[PDB]
Amino acid sequence: DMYIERAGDITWEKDAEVTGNSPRLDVALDESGDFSLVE
Amino acid sequence: GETTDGVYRVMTRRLLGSTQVGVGVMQEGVFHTMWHVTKGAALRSGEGRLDPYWGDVKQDLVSYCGPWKLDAAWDGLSEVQLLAVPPGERAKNIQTLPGIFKTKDGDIGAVALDYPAGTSGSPILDKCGRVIGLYGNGVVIKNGSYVSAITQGKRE
Numbered sequence: 001d002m003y004i005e006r007a008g009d010i011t012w013e014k015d016a017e018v019t020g021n022s023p024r025l026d027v028a029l030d031e032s033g034d035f036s037l038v039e
Numbered sequence: 040g041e042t043t044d045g046v047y048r049v050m051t052r053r054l055l056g057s058t059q060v061g062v063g064v065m066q067e068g069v070f071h072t073m074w075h076v077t078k079g080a081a082l083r084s085g086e087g088r089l090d091p092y093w094g095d096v097k098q099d100l101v102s103y104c105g106p107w108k109l110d111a112a113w114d115g116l117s118e119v120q121l122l123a124v125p126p127g128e129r130a131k132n133i134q135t136l137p138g139i140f141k142t143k144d145g146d147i148g149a150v151a152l153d154y155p156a157g158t159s160g161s162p163i164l165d166k167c168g169r170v171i172g173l174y175g176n177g178v179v180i181k182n183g184s185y186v187s188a189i190t191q192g193k194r195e
């Protein structure tokens with residue numbers, strides 16, 4: 001069986017670690033909910 | 040069980056030890072997570088039971104105890120925060136500027152942050168703290184890096 005356990009509040013943290021890029025990708029979504037790249 | 044608003048880990052004792060299969064959001068008495076985390080199964084919160092209420096495999100979303108409540112949207116311009124809850128690790132906010140998933144049915148925001156599979160269902164937030172979507176359904180691009188969609192449901 002699956003169970004839930006609290007992990008925290010949902011708040012914006014000022015001065016959180018800023019990382020990650022912003023790629024623009026052509027993608028397709030199938031009936032099973034799987035995303036794939038369109039080329 | 041615990042009905043306080045906040046982020047929660049989705050755990051299972053079926054496998055070896057206690058394993059974290061995902062994360063979710065409690066808001067207005069409803070638990071929100073990704074479909075691939077629970078497969079639509081019932082959830083336990085202490086002595087209490089959470090039953091599925093709405094779900095969709097294509098959207099890869101599921102709600103418990105009531106209808107989907109999260110309706111905030113990425114403004115398409117500003118940085119956001121992934122409130123990542125990794126297996127066995129403390130909740131941690133990560134700021135990023137989202138990319139774009141261009142589909143035949145419109146554009147969706149995307150976050151290029153790489154975390155373990157059991158981090159699926161972690162909320163993405165705007166500057167106001169509102170949940171604009173869940174992290175965990177995406178694609179693996181050329182250089183093997185992971186890019187998740189900012190997956191948001193519909194509030195009826």
Ligand SMILES: COC[C@H]1CN(c2ccccn2)CCO1
Binds near residue numbers: 157159176184
């Ligand atoms: C090279 O690919 C790395 C993994 C990343 N995965 C994730 C990551 C975060 C949340 C859900 N799934 C999907 C499977 O591939």
